[PDB]
Design a binder for this molecule. Structure first.
Ligand SMILES: NS(=O)(=O)c1ccc(-c2ccccc2)cc1
Ligand SMILES: [Zn+2]
Length: 257
């Protein structure tokens, strides 16, 4: 089964998932001098005031904070998007060292981690149908650098002890994802894919220019998670990121000068 190790990592995924070598794979390097300002791009609309978090799950490749997406409660709209996308979950990718961990890079710079807020297009009815569509998902990507602590992240950090191993979950209600956003919503956008198998080419990527800061202690606690299940040999959940993929016939657009 796929993973991030030497024998099952990103370089192997194409054997089970041939779309890994496709025409709109993610992540990519964001070349800031080649991205073009697009004045027709609208401001992002992040409406999270009514978000309803439910659960946090260690799925063996990251941890997901899951939301109630059975109504329009937490939605992303505007920017490059047509229509309404519902928040279903967020998760992170991170490194074994502060110098790596993000999936997207900015002028080849790697950040310590990257947050993905995953939304699906409500015109397709459910997430499973949405991932089968070229405009099925909108993922909001936010970089993390190590410095000052992010207060709104601490409730996530503090529950990780209870979901140490693959397949463990914990109640996680009343978490407000607005505490994870930077001040500015300036962004780059391009058409891409899920960054884990099945690597479906169904995502409008919206990557914020401004990173959030998290403390060394906060990201340290990410690195105490396990890829393995309970009672299996311990393998730390670190470096669960896919490296940058070829941009091919795509243009990255910027919302800002
Ligand atoms: N890292 S990501 O691009 O935001 C991503 C989100 C959901 C999924 C996923 C996992 C299982 C089934 C369908 C989609 C994969 C990747
Ligand atoms: Zn992700």
């Amino acid at each position: 089964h796929w993973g991030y190790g030497k024998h099952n990592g990103p370089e192997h995924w194409h054997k089970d998932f041939p779309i890994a070598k496709g025409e709109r794979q993610s992540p990519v390097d964001i070349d800031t001098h080649t991205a073009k300002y697009d004045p027709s791009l609208k401001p992002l609309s992040v409406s999270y005031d009514q978000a309803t978090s439910l659960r946090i799950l260690n799925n063996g490749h990251a941890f997901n904070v899951e939301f109630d997406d059975s109504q329009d409660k937490a939605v992303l709209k505007g920017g490059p998007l047509d229509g309404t996308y519902r928040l279903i979950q967020f998760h992170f990718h991170w490194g074994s060292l502060d110098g790596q961990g993000s999936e997207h890079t900015v002028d080849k710079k790697k950040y310590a981690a990257e947050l993905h807020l995953v939304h699906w297009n409500t015109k397709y009815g459910d997430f499973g149908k949405a991932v089968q569509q070229p405009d099925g998902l909108a993922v909001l990507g936010i970089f993390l650098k190590v410095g000052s602590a992010k207060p709104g992240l601490q409730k996530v950090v503090d529950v990780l002890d209870s979901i140490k191993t693959k397949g463990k979950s914990a109640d996680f209600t009343n978490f407000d994802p607005r505490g994870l956003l930077p001040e500015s919503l300036d962004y780059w956008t391009y058409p891409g894919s899920l960054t884990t198998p099945p690597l479906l080419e169904c995502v409008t990527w919206i990557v914020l220019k401004e990173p959030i800061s998290v403390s060394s202690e906060q990201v340290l606690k990410f690195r105490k998670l396990n890829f393995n299940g309970e009672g299996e040999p311990e393998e730390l959940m670190v470096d669960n990121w896919r490296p940058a993929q070829p941009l091919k016939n795509r243009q990255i657009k910027a919302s800002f000068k």
